[PDB]
Design a protein around this ligand. Structure first.
Ligand SMILES: CCOP(=O)(COc1ccc(C[C@H](NC(=O)O[C@H]2CO[C@H]3OCC[C@H]32)[C@H](O)CN(CC(C)C)S(=O)(=O)c2ccc(OC)cc2)cc1)OCC
Lengths: 99, 99
């Protein structure tokens, strides 16, 4: 389907058993979510944007269900002000920008 | 046209008669550009990002071309890591998300 941008393109994802409201973000290389527990090993990382950088934990090969698809990708967990779905996952579900 | 998301959706914009590279950002409500000169008076605006809040200069009814499409709207100028085209302008050029 088509999602307009009149309002923030929010979606509900299902990850690690939990449901979270997230933002389909083409300006984000990676998916960044608020503090939560995830399985597997992780690597510390620093990601920056407007306002500076925040320290996050990087988890790979994470299953996430978005827009009816079960995509696999990297998830950065940390003190982000809003849950963000980055290009790393958007590509997996075949999402594109059109005009 | 269609833009996939395997790479950053960087496009050429024209503002103040100059060409610049900007990121089509569905996660941004507003368009924020790197330090530059714009005509007229500006108003103050506080915007929040992943790393915190920053102060930006708000200019209204500014002409800006994005991917060859002409738009006239609000442009914020401040300490952003890269030029970002927010929803205020993405909507002006008929940009949407599709899957
Ligand atoms: C202090 C926070 O206050 P807040 O109001 C704002 O909360 C956010 C934070 C980040 C984003 C995504 C970025 N949009 C944003 O900053 O938007 C700005 C401009 O429009 C305004 O409206 C939304 C917040 C202003 C942008 O799309 C992605 N950034 C990357 C890019 C600018 C280079 S990013 O989030 O820093 C990022 C993501 C993934 C990465 O992996 C490598 C790296 C970096 C949206 C909303 O929340 C209060 C509860």
């Amino acid at each position: 389907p088509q999602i307009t941008l009149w309002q923030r393109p929010l979606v509900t994802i299902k990850i690690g058993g939990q449901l979270k409201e997230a933002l389909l973000d083409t300006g984000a290389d990676d998916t960044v979510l608020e503090e939560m527990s995830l399985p597997g090993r992780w690597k510390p990382k620093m990601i920056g944007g407007i306002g500076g950088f925040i320290k996050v934990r990087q988890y790979d090969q994470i299953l996430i269900e978005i827009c009816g698809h079960k995509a696999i990708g990297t998830v950065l967990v940390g003190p982000t002000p809003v849950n963000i779905i980055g290009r790393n996952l958007l590509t997996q579900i075949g999402m594109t920008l059109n005009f």
